Ligand binder design. Structure first.
Ligand SMILES: *[C@H](C)[C@H]1/C(=C/c2[nH]c(/C=C3N=C(/C=C4\NC(=O)C(CC)=C4C)C(C)=C\3CCC(=O)O)c(CCC(=O)O)c2C)NC(=O)[C@@H]1C
Ligand SMILES: *[C@H](C)[C@H]1/C(=C/c2[nH]c(/C=C3N=C(/C=C4\NC(=O)C(CC)=C4C)C(C)=C\3CCC(=O)O)c(CCC(=O)O)c2C)NC(=O)[C@@H]1C
Ligand SMILES: [Mg+2]
Ligand SMILES: [Mg+2]
Lengths: 162, 162
């Protein structure tokens, strides 16, 4: 919901002022990293299923009980594994949203808001998703500024879980 | 607020999907003009007072009665001239907003919505502001796409007054 440009423009219109030079430089900085953020979003989108399966398997190997113990919260049956892949897809989709927007707005609204309440209500462990995000970070195949932006948002999500 | 970025993000989030390649291309089309848009907005912001004064003067020369009439409607005293400069400042400010946002969103939300109502209630002639915008378009001193951006938001405002 929140992007840098929109917040700046709304505040300026409330005050009835032109945008300050600091605001202009912030928006210019967002635009200067926009091509790398676009490359990062394209990489994450085109390799989404491979990254999701790798991350889910990494969780399964770091937390083996999740594949052995019966119960709704775990991934013993195919339903639980599908739910796990779906959760990781949630994270990756909102990460691409934040990359496209060039800010933490999408992650703050669609994911982080109440995240701990969600994980505790359905007995989900945050370390699972931390490890899945570590896997996605270490396997996105990005280089340069695109890797920097992708890592920025992945680390943001990780910190939200931490 | 509605920009070409938030549009694609909302259209992708409501369906629980990633951004389509068409949406990616629209976002990249905004990005490939962001540089010229920022150049135009910076130029118009830095030379705002001179442009406002020149546009007000051009309005006074094209419509001389506006400087010779009594009544709150017109600008014979200093109060009316100050109000006219303030109106032109509104126009230029919202135009810079639309430049920074890369779309007609800010112009639609802050200016055009109710503009006919404003100009009719207080008996302000839209041709005045049309001539002021013509002066701005002829005297912004921009080149290349930076002009093409500025012009495309001037004419828009002009089209909203016709
Ligand atoms: C995979 C890493 C591990 C795992 C996954 C799992 N989840 C459920 C249920 C849910 N997961 C969520 C998460 C979200 N929904 C959102 O909108 C957002 C923000 C974008 C998040 C983070 C939710 C809400 C649920 C409950 C609702 C639902 O099931 O759709 C299950 C099944 C639990 C159950 O009680 O049925 C599983 C298995 N569990 C593991 O063991 C994997 C390692
Ligand atoms: C100057 C080009 C000509 C002109 C100016 C003039 N304006 C007023 C007062 C008003 N101008 C507006 C326009 C807007 N207010 C907004 O918020 C927006 C959108 C951002 C716009 C476009 C309005 C609403 C008013 C009335 C409110 C106010 O007075 O502050 C006057 C005085 C009119 C009166 O009766 O008080 C004048 C003179 N008139 C000319 O002759 C100039 C050529
Ligand atoms: Mg809490
Ligand atoms: Mg009309």
């Amino acid at each position: 919901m929140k992007t840098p440009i929109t917040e700046a423009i709304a505040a300026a219109d409330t005050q009835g002022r032109f945008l300050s030079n600091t605001e202009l430089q912030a928006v210019n900085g967002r635009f200067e990293r926009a091509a790398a953020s676009m490359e990062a979003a394209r990489a994450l989108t085109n390799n989404a299923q491979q990254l999701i399966d790798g991350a889910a398997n990494a969780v399964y190997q770091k937390f083996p009980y999740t594949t052995q113990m019966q119960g709704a919260n775990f991934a013993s049956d195919s339903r639980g594994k599908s739910k796990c892949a779906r959760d990781i897809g949630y994270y990756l989709r909102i990460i691409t949203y934040s990359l496209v927007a060039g800010g933490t707005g999408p992650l703050d609204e669609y994911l982080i808001a109440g995240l701990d309440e969600i994980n505790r209500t359905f007995d989900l462990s945050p370390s699972w998703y931390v490890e899945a995000l570590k896997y996605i970070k270490a396997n996105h195949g990005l280089s340069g500024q695109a890797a920097n932006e992708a890592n920025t948002y992945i680390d943001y999500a990780i910190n939200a879980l931490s």
